[PDB]
Amino acid sequence: WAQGREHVVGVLQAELEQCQAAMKALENSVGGRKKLKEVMSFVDKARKGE
């Protein structure tokens, strides 16, 4: 259990890093990070009641 505990951190964080990169990757594709954050603001808003 202790061994699985030590390994899960390095693995899980490596999954997170590829996740953030894929996000940046989507950022460049859409255009500006600022623009993508705008569309994200529109979707979050539409998802909330705003």
Partner: protein, 49 residues
């Protein structure tokens, strides 16, 4: 920058209707500046005569 399209769909992250909206926006900008510049010309001393 160069784009090479007669009809660009997404360039610099912008949709086909978004490029139209910016073009019109630059037309309005150059129109506005020219209008300001002509108002300044009307208040110029050289239009007094």
């Amino acid at each position: 920058i160069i784009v090479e399209g007669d009809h660009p769909s997404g360039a610099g992250g912008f949709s086909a209707a978004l490029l139209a909206r910016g073009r019109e926006a630059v037309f309005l900008r150059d129109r506005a500046d020219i209008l300001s510049l002509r108002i300044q010309a009307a208040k110029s001393r050289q239009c007094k005569t």
